[PDB]
Design a protein around this motif. Structure first.
Motif, PDB file in Angstrom:
ATOM      1  N   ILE A  65       0.791  -1.268  -0.080  1.00  0.00           N
ATOM      2  CA  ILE A  65      -0.063  -0.053   0.152  1.00  0.00           C
ATOM      3  C   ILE A  65       0.820   1.344   0.173  1.00  0.00           C
ATOM      4  O   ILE A  65       0.700   2.235  -1.014  1.00  0.00           O
ATOM      5  N   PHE A  66       1.615   1.661   1.088  1.00  0.00           N
ATOM      6  CA  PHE A  66       2.220   2.772   1.228  1.00  0.00           C
ATOM      7  C   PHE A  66       3.491   2.936   0.426  1.00  0.00           C
ATOM      8  O   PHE A  66       4.083   4.021   0.211  1.00  0.00           O
ATOM      9  N   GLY A  67       4.265   2.018   0.215  1.00  0.00           N
ATOM     10  CA  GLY A  67       5.650   2.018  -0.190  1.00  0.00           C
ATOM     11  C   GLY A  67       6.643   2.945   0.394  1.00  0.00           C
ATOM     12  O   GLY A  67       6.903   2.753   1.582  1.00  0.00           O
ATOM     13  N   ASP A  68       7.252   4.019  -0.464  1.00  0.00           N
ATOM     14  CA  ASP A  68       8.014   5.007   0.052  1.00  0.00           C
ATOM     15  C   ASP A  68       7.396   5.995   0.639  1.00  0.00           C
ATOM     16  O   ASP A  68       7.974   7.001   0.862  1.00  0.00           O
ATOM     17  N   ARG A  69       6.072   6.382   0.213  1.00  0.00           N
ATOM     18  CA  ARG A  69       5.344   7.404   0.566  1.00  0.00           C
ATOM     19  C   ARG A  69       5.269   7.675   2.128  1.00  0.00           C
ATOM     20  O   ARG A  69       5.236   6.627   2.638  1.00  0.00           O
ATOM     21  N   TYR A  80      -3.296  12.127   4.705  1.00  0.00           N
ATOM     22  CA  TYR A  80      -2.992  12.584   3.660  1.00  0.00           C
ATOM     23  C   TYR A  80      -1.796  12.079   2.924  1.00  0.00           C
ATOM     24  O   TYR A  80      -0.945  11.474   3.729  1.00  0.00           O
ATOM     25  N   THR A  81      -1.465  12.280   1.577  1.00  0.00           N
ATOM     26  CA  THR A  81      -0.331  11.753   0.920  1.00  0.00           C
ATOM     27  C   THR A  81       0.026  12.783  -0.012  1.00  0.00           C
ATOM     28  O   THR A  81      -1.030  13.378  -0.558  1.00  0.00           O
ATOM     29  N   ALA A  82       1.361  12.891  -0.367  1.00  0.00           N
ATOM     30  CA  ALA A  82       1.790  13.840  -1.459  1.00  0.00           C
ATOM     31  C   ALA A  82       1.784  12.943  -2.896  1.00  0.00           C
ATOM     32  O   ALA A  82       1.779  13.769  -3.728  1.00  0.00           O
ATOM     33  N   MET A  83       1.570  11.792  -2.785  1.00  0.00           N
ATOM     34  CA  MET A  83       1.170  11.012  -3.956  1.00  0.00           C
ATOM     35  C   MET A  83       0.262   9.903  -3.837  1.00  0.00           C
ATOM     36  O   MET A  83       0.269   9.202  -2.707  1.00  0.00           O
ATOM     37  N   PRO A  84      -0.732   9.905  -4.783  1.00  0.00           N
ATOM     38  CA  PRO A  84      -1.761   8.911  -4.492  1.00  0.00           C
ATOM     39  C   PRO A  84      -1.580   7.649  -4.404  1.00  0.00           C
ATOM     40  O   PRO A  84      -0.777   7.145  -4.968  1.00  0.00           O
ATOM     41  N   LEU A  85      -2.345   6.985  -3.324  1.00  0.00           N
ATOM     42  CA  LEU A  85      -1.935   5.625  -3.052  1.00  0.00           C
ATOM     43  C   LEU A  85      -2.429   4.581  -4.096  1.00  0.00           C
ATOM     44  O   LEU A  85      -3.354   5.081  -4.796  1.00  0.00           O
ATOM     45  N   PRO A  86      -1.978   3.551  -4.228  1.00  0.00           N
ATOM     46  CA  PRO A  86      -2.586   2.352  -5.099  1.00  0.00           C
ATOM     47  C   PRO A  86      -3.925   1.873  -4.652  1.00  0.00           C
ATOM     48  O   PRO A  86      -4.300   0.855  -4.739  1.00  0.00           O
ATOM     49  N   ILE A  87      -4.661   2.887  -4.371  1.00  0.00           N
ATOM     50  CA  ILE A  87      -6.177   2.819  -3.927  1.00  0.00           C
ATOM     51  C   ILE A  87      -7.051   3.057  -4.986  1.00  0.00           C
ATOM     52  O   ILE A  87      -8.127   2.346  -5.522  1.00  0.00           O
ATOM     53  N   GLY A  88      -6.851   4.107  -5.663  1.00  0.00           N
ATOM     54  CA  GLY A  88      -7.608   4.845  -6.588  1.00  0.00           C
ATOM     55  C   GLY A  88      -8.877   5.288  -6.447  1.00  0.00           C
ATOM     56  O   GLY A  88      -9.444   6.269  -6.728  1.00  0.00           O
ATOM     57  N   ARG A  89      -9.723   4.402  -5.558  1.00  0.00           N
ATOM     58  CA  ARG A  89     -11.031   5.053  -4.867  1.00  0.00           C
ATOM     59  C   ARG A  89     -11.604   3.831  -3.756  1.00  0.00           C
ATOM     60  O   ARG A  89     -12.092   4.069  -2.813  1.00  0.00           O
ATOM     61  N   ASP A  90     -11.656   2.730  -4.364  1.00  0.00           N
ATOM     62  CA  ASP A  90     -12.226   1.384  -3.687  1.00  0.00           C
ATOM     63  C   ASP A  90     -11.573   1.206  -2.371  1.00  0.00           C
ATOM     64  O   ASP A  90     -10.282   1.247  -1.921  1.00  0.00           O
ATOM     65  N   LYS A  91     -12.367   1.291  -1.132  1.00  0.00           N
ATOM     66  CA  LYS A  91     -12.301   1.271   0.163  1.00  0.00           C
ATOM     67  C   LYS A  91     -11.555  -0.454   0.568  1.00  0.00           C
ATOM     68  O   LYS A  91     -11.851  -1.469  -0.224  1.00  0.00           O
ATOM     69  N   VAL A  92     -10.383  -0.330   1.237  1.00  0.00           N
ATOM     70  CA  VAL A  92      -9.757  -1.522   1.810  1.00  0.00           C
ATOM     71  C   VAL A  92      -9.845  -1.698   3.213  1.00  0.00           C
ATOM     72  O   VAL A  92     -10.008  -0.800   4.063  1.00  0.00           O
ATOM     73  N   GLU A  93      -9.735  -3.003   3.790  1.00  0.00           N
ATOM     74  CA  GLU A  93      -9.878  -3.240   5.196  1.00  0.00           C
ATOM     75  C   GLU A  93      -8.729  -3.944   5.618  1.00  0.00           C
ATOM     76  O   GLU A  93      -8.000  -4.552   5.178  1.00  0.00           O
ATOM     77  N   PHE A 101      -7.058  -3.932  15.854  1.00  0.00           N
ATOM     78  CA  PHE A 101      -8.139  -2.838  15.443  1.00  0.00           C
ATOM     79  C   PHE A 101      -8.568  -3.131  13.916  1.00  0.00           C
ATOM     80  O   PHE A 101      -7.629  -3.830  13.262  1.00  0.00           O
ATOM     81  N   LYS A 102      -9.471  -2.682  13.461  1.00  0.00           N
ATOM     82  CA  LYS A 102      -9.842  -2.834  12.096  1.00  0.00           C
ATOM     83  C   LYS A 102     -10.068  -1.619  11.341  1.00  0.00           C
ATOM     84  O   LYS A 102     -11.002  -0.751  11.612  1.00  0.00           O
ATOM     85  N   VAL A 103      -8.969  -1.166  10.486  1.00  0.00           N
ATOM     86  CA  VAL A 103      -8.939   0.312   9.869  1.00  0.00           C
ATOM     87  C   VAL A 103      -9.308   0.114   8.644  1.00  0.00           C
ATOM     88  O   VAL A 103      -8.594  -0.757   7.684  1.00  0.00           O
ATOM     89  N   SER A 104     -10.098   1.142   7.905  1.00  0.00           N
ATOM     90  CA  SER A 104     -10.536   0.984   6.507  1.00  0.00           C
ATOM     91  C   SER A 104      -9.748   2.367   6.005  1.00  0.00           C
ATOM     92  O   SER A 104      -9.921   3.532   6.878  1.00  0.00           O
ATOM     93  N   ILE A 105      -9.372   2.511   4.863  1.00  0.00           N
ATOM     94  CA  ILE A 105      -9.034   3.522   4.083  1.00  0.00           C
ATOM     95  C   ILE A 105      -9.501   3.802   2.879  1.00  0.00           C
ATOM     96  O   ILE A 105      -9.667   2.900   1.965  1.00  0.00           O
ATOM     97  N   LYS A 106     -10.285   5.014   2.538  1.00  0.00           N
ATOM     98  CA  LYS A 106     -11.068   5.392   1.524  1.00  0.00           C
ATOM     99  C   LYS A 106     -10.784   6.740   0.728  1.00  0.00           C
ATOM    100  O   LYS A 106     -10.825   7.702   1.801  1.00  0.00           O
ATOM    101  N   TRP A 107     -10.281   6.863  -0.387  1.00  0.00           N
ATOM    102  CA  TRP A 107     -10.127   7.932  -0.964  1.00  0.00           C
ATOM    103  C   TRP A 107     -11.352   9.154  -0.964  1.00  0.00           C
ATOM    104  O   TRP A 107     -12.419   8.603  -1.334  1.00  0.00           O
TER     105      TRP A 107
END
Ligand code: TRP
Ligand code: TRP
Length: 794
Positions: A65-69, A80-93, A101-107
């Motif tokens: 997900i986060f790589g070098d970001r 926030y990120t200075a570069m868009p994550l490989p998420i594009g839009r769809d939520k991930v769990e 904990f259960k964390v979801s991230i959504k653009w």
RNA sequence: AAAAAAAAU
């Protein structure tokens, strides 16, 4: 009641002066910032835990997900990120482990830094963009330090007593200005609770050298209860709890329902439980227990520590704040260096996260051209009618007399200090010196006091005052003498202001034993105005064009309790000088910042103005204190409508021009002289009257800084004034000159004060109301009819 | 409260 007016023009009055502000220019890229939402479940964790979760989440999921970001996090939902994550839009769990904990991230959105740039030049401000920047700048310090609001603190050692401590740190905030984004950095310090065993905390609170006893009396218990109630404790036998109350019973007798193996519940003592369950015989079973969580868990004092990093909210004792003032006060050149050291150690330009977002912060303080406004001349009366010229925000009353000084013929003395210490010789010496000075002040006190006796106890005030009022006709004043802090002052005022309606001037015992001309002179300033007298006025011809037509000046402020109600106070000028103010005051909702009953209060003042001047004010100038920027739109809405409602309620076609101005003293912008020749006093502060309405102020709206006062101690706070509304269409100069002149109309001292007199009076009124507070609350605050025609709060 | 400024289980 909607949008703040644009800045009409730039001020040009006064001589220029080179300043520097603790604002550091930010070079910000024109890119897009990427905004993601975070649903952490559970969702009630403290912000620190959320930050730990996010931190581990980023590293643990580097590969996929986060790589070098390097992302930044606001502590709650926004990442926030200075570069868009490989998420594009769809939520991930996701999952995270410290336990699970259960964390979801959504653009959500793209924060346009370009949209910010154009807002800064003109057209014409994305708050979420400012917030994105703020999150970036304070991501790192939020992990290394202890954030309190917008500040950051750490421990060093610097005791204040009572279980309290001093922590040094800094304020940090990103602020819009014309053409630029600014980083506001200032050194700070606040009170924290010392991390220590509760046992030791008890000693510091109850003044024990060592705890080594016998059960606390009901008094010791409520003192200690007040101190620890609401604080966090940790257990020595790693678990954190919230103290909600201290038990009335000791641990050896305090019981709780305990469920046994059979399922049956019985009452078991806390002492017995800690013995059976934890093999622990309580060292101090006679001491009470901390009730924690919510209702039946009790903790013995000897197994609990005060959790570290707890900021102190409660009122400081007079001695506690004193050493705090002393340990925190630094001259203007001193503070400027500490901010420089802070910039050097914070080292923003090497912070990984601001580098990630391509932000650059300058390590040089912003150069600002300020203007030192000319002070108004102060007109006095008496024989020569002398004109005083403030020099460095200060003048005096040597060779001068009151504009209209009240001749005192009948007055009484009520000494609540023992004759033992305040002797008859003292009174006679005090009385003699007081009269000589008063004579010179143009407020001649003829005749010895008609009455002069001693007393003790608050219960003795009214019958004694009932007495004086009924027997001495023409009685103008009762000078009351008090030995230090004592609840009779509150009683003297309650009886004097609300019940009988008599002017009373309280004075300390020490200022009677040892009198000085300056102290006595300052005492006469208050006495004169409390008898309806006029100390001095602004030089009439040295006044802005606003005084051409009937105008009323309002000062509003609400004070909050140290549960207990908040107190709103609104004062209004009653002449054209302007000098005399009538006061309106209300109790209202606990911690409610908006003056609820404003419309009613403004109406009362408008009536009082009309009965005093026989004129209806064509303009209403409203100085509103005690409001944060995050509450402007809300306060401007109800309150501008409220005062507009008062005019309509009065008369249908009565529509005076309203100028709504908020005054802020609580901010972290500092101004320093560039030239050492311009420094004033040992504190080396900017001179009284330097005004800033350029470069560091609002890009579009009408706001300015005005340091109207002379810095005596530490670094001056230049008062900030933000014009939320203005039907009167003031120029920058006329307004800035107006509020500056109003700072010279404060009757309690021959000095220019930090805020305009109506705003200052509002503070005094609401605070006098506190002492009046010993539906019935609204009455213990309502003030006698005859006192209203006086500035009793002076 | 002579006063301004100053931290703020
Ligand atoms: N009676 C006032 C009239 C006046 C002119 N400008 C004012 C401003 C405020 C109050 C009254 C006035 C004179 O003197
Ligand atoms: N009601 C006021 C008269 C009045 C009408 N409109 C006003 C506006 C301001 C002051 C007074 C008035 C008297 O009594």
């Amino acid at each position: 009641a909607f949008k703040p007016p644009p800045r009409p023009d730039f001020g040009t009055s006064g001589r220029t002066i080179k300043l520097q502000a603790n604002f550091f220019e930010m070079d910000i890229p024109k890119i897009d910032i990427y905004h993601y939402e975070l649903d952490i479940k559970p969702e009630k964790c403290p912000r620190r835990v959320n930050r730990e979760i996010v931190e581990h989440m980023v590293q643990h999921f580097k590969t996929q997900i986060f790589g070098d970001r390097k992302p930044v996090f606001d502590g709650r939902k926004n990442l926030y990120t200075a570069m868009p994550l490989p998420i594009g839009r769809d939520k991930v769990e996701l999952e995270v482990t410290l336990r699970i904990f259960k964390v979801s991230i959504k653009w959500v959105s793209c924060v346009s830094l370009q949209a910010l740039h154009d807002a800064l030049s003109g057209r014409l401000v994305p708050f979420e963009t400012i917030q994105a920047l703020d999150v970036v700048m304070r991501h790192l310090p939020s992990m290394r330090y202890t954030p309190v609001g917008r500040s950051f603190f750490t421990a060093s050692s610097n005791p204040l007593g009572g279980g309290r401590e001093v922590w040094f740190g800094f304020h940090q905030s990103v602020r819009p200005s014309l053409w630029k984004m600014m980083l506001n950095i200032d050194v700070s310090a606040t009170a924290f609770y010392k991390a220590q065993p509760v046992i030791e905390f008890v000693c510091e609170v109850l003044d024990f050298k060592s705890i080594e006893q016998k059960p606390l009396t009901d008094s010791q218990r409520v003192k200690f209860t007040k101190e620890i109630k609401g604080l966090k404790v940790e257990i020595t036998h790693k678990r954190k709890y919230r103290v909600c109350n201290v038990t009335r019973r000791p641990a050896s007798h305090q019981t709780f329902p305990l469920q046994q193996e059979s399922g049956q519940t019985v009452e078991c003592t806390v002492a017995q439980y800690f013995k059976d369950r934890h093999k622990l015989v309580l060292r101090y079973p006679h001491l009470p227990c901390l009730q924690v969580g919510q209702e039946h868990t009790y903790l013995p004092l000897e197994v609990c520590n005060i959790v570290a990093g707890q900021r102190c909210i409660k009122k400081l004792t007079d001695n506690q704040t004193s050493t705090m003032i002393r340990a925190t006060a630094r001259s203007a050149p001193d503070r400027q260096e500490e901010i420089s050291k802070l910039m050097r150690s914070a080292d923003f330009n090497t912070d990984p996260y601001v580098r990630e977002f391509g932000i650059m912060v300058k390590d040089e303080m912003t150069d600002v051209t300020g203007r030192v406004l000319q002070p108004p001349s102060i007109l006095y009366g008496g024989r020569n009618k002398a004109i005083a010229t403030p020099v460095q925000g200060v003048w005096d009353m040597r060779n001068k007399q009151f504009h209209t000084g009240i001749e005192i013929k009948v007055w009484a003395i009520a000494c609540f200090a023992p004759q033992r210490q305040c002797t008859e010789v003292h009174l006679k010496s005090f009385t003699e010196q007081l009269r000589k000075i008063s004579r010179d002040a143009g407020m001649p006190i003829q005749g010895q006091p008609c009455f002069c006796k001693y007393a003790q106890g608050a219960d003795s005030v009214e019958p004694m005052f009932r007495h004086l009022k009924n027997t001495y006709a023409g009685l103008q004043l009762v000078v009351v003498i008090l030995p230090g802090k004592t609840p009779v002052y509150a009683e003297v005022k309650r009886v004097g202001d609300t019940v009988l309606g008599m002017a009373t001037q309280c004075v300390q015992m020490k200022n009677v034993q040892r009198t000085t001309p300056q102290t006595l002179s300052n005492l006469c300033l208050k006495i004169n105005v409390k008898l309806g007298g006029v100390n001095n006025i602004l030089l009439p011809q040295g006044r802005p064009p606003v005084f051409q037509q009937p105008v009323i000046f309002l000062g509003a402020d609400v004070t909050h309790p140290p549960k207990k109600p908040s107190i709103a106070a609104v004062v209004g000028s009653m002449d054209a000088h302007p000098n005399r103010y009538c006061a309106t005051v209300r109790v209202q909702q606990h911690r409610q910042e908006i003056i609820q009953d404003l419309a009613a209060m403004v109406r009362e003042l408008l009536i009082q103005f009309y009965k005093s001047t026989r004129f209806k004010p064509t303009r209403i100038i409203f100085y509103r204190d005690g409001v944060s920027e995050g509450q402007f739109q809300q306060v401007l809405h109800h309150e501008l409508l409220a005062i507009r409602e008062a005019c309509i309620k009065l008369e249908k076609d009565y529509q005076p021009g309203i100028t709504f101005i908020v005054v802020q003293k609580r901010h972290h912008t500092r101004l320093f002289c560039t030239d050492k020749n311009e420094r004033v006093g040992k504190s080396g502060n900017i001179p009284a009257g330097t005004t800033v309405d350029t470069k560091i102020t609002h890009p579009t709206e009408f706001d300015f800084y005005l340091c109207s006062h002379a810095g005596i101690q530490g670094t001056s706070r230049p008062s900030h004034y933000h014009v939320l509304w203005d039907d009167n269409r003031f120029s920058s100069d006329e307004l800035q000159i107006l509020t500056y002149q109003l700072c010279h109309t404060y009757v309690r001292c021959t000095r220019s004060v930090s805020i305009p007199a109506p705003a200052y009076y509002a503070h005094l009124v609401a605070f006098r109301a506190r002492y009046h507070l010993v539906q019935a609350l609204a009455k213990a605050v309502q003030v006698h009819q005859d006192t209203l025609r006086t500035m009793y709060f002076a």
